[PDB]
Amino acid sequence: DAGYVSQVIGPVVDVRFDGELPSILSSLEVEGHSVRLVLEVAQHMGDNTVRCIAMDSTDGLVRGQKVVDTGSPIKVPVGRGTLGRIMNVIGEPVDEQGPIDAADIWSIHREAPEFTEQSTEQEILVTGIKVVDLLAPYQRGGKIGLFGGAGVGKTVLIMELINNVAKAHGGFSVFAGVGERTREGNDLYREMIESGVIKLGAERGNSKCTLVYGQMNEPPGARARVALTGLTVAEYFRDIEGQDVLLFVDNIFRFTQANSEVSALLGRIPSAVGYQPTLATDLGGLQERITTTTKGSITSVQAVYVPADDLTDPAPATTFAHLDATTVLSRSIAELGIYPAVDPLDSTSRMLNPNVIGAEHYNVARGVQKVLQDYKNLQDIIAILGMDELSEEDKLTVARARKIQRFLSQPFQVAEVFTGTPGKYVDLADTISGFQGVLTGKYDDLPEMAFYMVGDIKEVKEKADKMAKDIASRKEADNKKVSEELKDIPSLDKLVSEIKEVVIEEDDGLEEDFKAEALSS
Amino acid sequence: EHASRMSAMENSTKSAGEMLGKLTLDYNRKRQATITTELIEIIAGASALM
Amino acid sequence: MRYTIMVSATASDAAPLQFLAPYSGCAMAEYFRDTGKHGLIIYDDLSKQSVAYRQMSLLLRRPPGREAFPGDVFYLHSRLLERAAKLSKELGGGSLTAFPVIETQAGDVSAYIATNVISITDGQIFLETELFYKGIRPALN
Amino acid sequence: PIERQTVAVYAATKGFLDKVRVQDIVAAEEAVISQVNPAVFKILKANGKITPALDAHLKAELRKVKLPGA
Ligand SMILES: Nc1ncnc2c1ncn2[C@@H]1O[C@H](COP(=O)(O)OP(=O)(O)O)[C@@H](O)[C@H]1O
Ligand SMILES: [Mg+2]
């Protein structure tokens, strides 16, 4: 009736079943474990043995431990009762707010929709980020990828896309935290209590977001299936309630890394640079479910970590064919201080056709990319020689591109604690109007750093007029202010005497604490 | 001045061709070595299963 | 579409089904070659077929070679691409023109599947991304 | 300590350590930490901020200092 553990090697458990093996992808429960240990059948090994991956740690598993087949795959709660909650990979609440109310429980494994129920509709998703909505504009209903190595700004950009797109739109949101830091998953949770996206207590039904978290400490079996769990919550909102969903996945790279960590223990000889042989089809089975169908619409935004800033690597390179907008973030843009560090040339969207976004958005975007590409072909000769042989046609396209480079920078409303600047939402029309000014020489007289970290072209003129006030405001405070004051710069021990001297205890006293922890519990 | 810059920029295209030739020999050696290295990693992982 | 067939083995399809789709698309296109008409076959991402075939071979425990590809991965693409011919006049005179599509990474044509298909095919249309942002579209090197 | 780091970074970012030879900035700030007031560190450690009652009061106390060369 039930099976027993026959082999435990790392996160991969073999379970021997006397009679009627469970199906592949089905969920098994190990009873007698300290925590709830869910296994998922990866393959039939062939001697009435299945090979499984564990959704938790296998420390404490014993050969011979009873394993109960559940008869179905991993089933998670879906519905409005998950809005405002944090789920596990297996659907357990990890926010300590009680059990999750469930309209239905759904298998996290399903097939891709079909070819017949695909949606061929392109409408722009305006994000407020002017480098995005100019050069690589996002599609309302399409898959969006945020590429970039470690520390270029994938999580700040995906945080700014949350409060610029999900903070006011019609449907619901799902954040799938797949194998990233627990600290920033708590930062995202507490930011959405304060923003009112997640409401706690009796106002929980007015939430607009569900978190599904599978962060870095979880075993590779867990992180390989969180993206399927968060997608299942998004697939209920699309298939059953028929409405538009936003699905944010932080590092879809970690889904491919997690399958790669168990892959050799599942008996697979490795593929190229170290990934599993099923790398493209494991990834393709996931991304083909995140689609706009004829029932509703899932606007996916996936961060993709590129390892060692390498877009050639097979896990980022496979993701590129799955997306409708690939915002590529670069370290060289980040090292100059342009934030968001979007590579303006490498970012590609499918909404950048003239018959989709119009001609006055397409030609500005193709004009901005031409001036930035020409500058990179001159920067080979500027960094050697130094722009005194550059024709004053080439000198103007260096000054125009350097204004274009800073004008793609924008202060983010969520990066207000990194950059000391309140964030700017730029509308789509003000982005088109601004870059058409910088391209056609309408703003050639303004300084270069007047474009840096501003909203639109009206705030370049409110910053160039500000800096030309405040550089000639230097010499008021030179000849004075050293002495002769109203004595609110007072004497020495005047400022030392309001120092409330805190009592130092001059010994740690932990052995009195350690005995006190023995008497408690 | 133009005729000594011409002899100076001839001596630096040679120096940037001699350096480019040593780098391409160094790149082909690294190109051959990483193909051997990735292949030994693949056969070792296969021999551990077979 | 009144002249086009589309053979579509998408990303969620099994790796055997993406391996066989250029061959089953070629057999559909070989109908027009063999009956005197003219064909145009396009294998868009033939480099994605070879990844699907490498998946089947490592899982069938066939011995891997360079970048874990099989031994017969040159024979995979050559046996497919050599079916694009111009027939002689006593066989109808029909033809099949192939356009395999190979995606390089950082313009590396020394990659293993890329050197295989460059050997098999007659020409190449190299599209360089540096010319793509200079406004030169089609970005033909 | 963190209060002598920010005072030495104040002495370099408020322009008090140009006119100083670049070879002996290492020995210039060894004066600057030792020749300013030992009570100005206690206020910066207790406040944690360099207050408006102190950023002039320290930059006018970063003038009564003897730097090498000068
Ligand atoms: N838009 C931005 N504005 C200001 N600083 C940024 C921005 N994006 C990234 N950064 C800086 O880069 C650091 C790393 O960004 P992070 O969001 O952690 O990217 P990743 O998740 O790719 O590592 C941040 O802590 C922040 O200091
Ligand atoms: Mg991150």
Description:
The structure is cut from a larger assembly and holds 1 copy of chain A (521 residues), 1 copy of chain B (50 residues) and 2 copies of chain C. Chain A is of the alpha/beta class and 521 residues long. In chain A, 31% of the residues lie in helices and 17% in strands. Chain A has helices at residues 130-135, 154-166, 182-194, 220-223, 226-239, 253-262, 279-287, 314-319, 331-334, 354-357, 359-382, 394-407, 428-439, 457-470, 492-496, 510-519; strands at 3-9, 12-17, 27-30, 37-44, 49-54, 66-69, 75-78, 86-87, 104-107, 124-125, 138-139, 143-148, 172-178, 209-214, 244-250, 297-305, 325-328, 348-349. In chain A, α11 (359-382) crosses α12 (394-407) and α11 packs across α13. Chain A is globular. The two termini of chain A are 41 Å apart. Chain B has one domain (9-50): ATP synthase, gamma subunit, helix hairpin domain (Helix Hairpins, Orthogonal Bundle). Chain B contains 1 helix and no strands. With 50 residues, chain B is mostly helical. Chain B is 92% helix and 0% strand. With 141 residues, chain C is mainly alpha-helical. Chain C is built from 6 helices and 2 strands. Chain C has helices at residues 15-19, 21-34, 47-59, 73-81, 112-120, 129-132; strands at 38-43, 95-100. A two-stranded parallel sheet of chain C has the order 1-2. In chain C, α4 runs parallel beside α5 (112-120). The radius of gyration of chain C is 16 Å and the shape is globular. Chain C starts with 14 loop residues before the first helix and ends in a 9-residue tail after the last helix. The structure holds adenosine-5'-diphosphate and magnesium ion. Magnesium ion is lined by residues 154-155, 180 of chain A. Chain A: It comes from Polytomella sp. Pringsheim 198.80.
Question: Would you kindly provide a brief summary of this structure?
Answer:
Helix content of chain A is 31%, strand content 17%.
Furnish the topology, listing elements before pairings:
This is part of a larger assembly, with 1 copy of chain A (about 525 residues), 1 copy of chain B (about 50 residues) and 2 copies of chain C.
Chain A: E1 3-9, E2 12-17, E3 27-30, E4 37-44, E5 49-54, E6 66-69, E7 75-78, E8 86-87, E9 104-107, E10 124-125, H1 130-135, E11 138-139, E12 143-148, H2 154-166, E13 172-178, H3 182-194, E14 209-214, H4 220-223, H5 226-239, E15 244-250, H6 253-262, H7 279-287, E16 297-305, H8 314-319, E17 325-328, H9 331-334, E18 348-349, H10 354-357, H11 359-382, H12 394-407, H13 428-439, H14 457-470, H15 492-496, H16 510-519
Chain B: H1 2-47
Chain C: H1 15-19, H2 21-34, E1 38-43, H3 47-59, H4 73-81, E2 95-100, H5 112-120, H6 129-132
Parallel strand pairs in C: 1-2
Helix pairs in contact in C: 4-5
The complex binds adenosine-5'-diphosphate and magnesium ion (MG).
Organism (chain C): Polytomella sp. Pringsheim 198.80
Family (chain C): Belongs to the ATPase alpha/beta chains family.
Protein name (chain C): ATP synthase subunit alpha
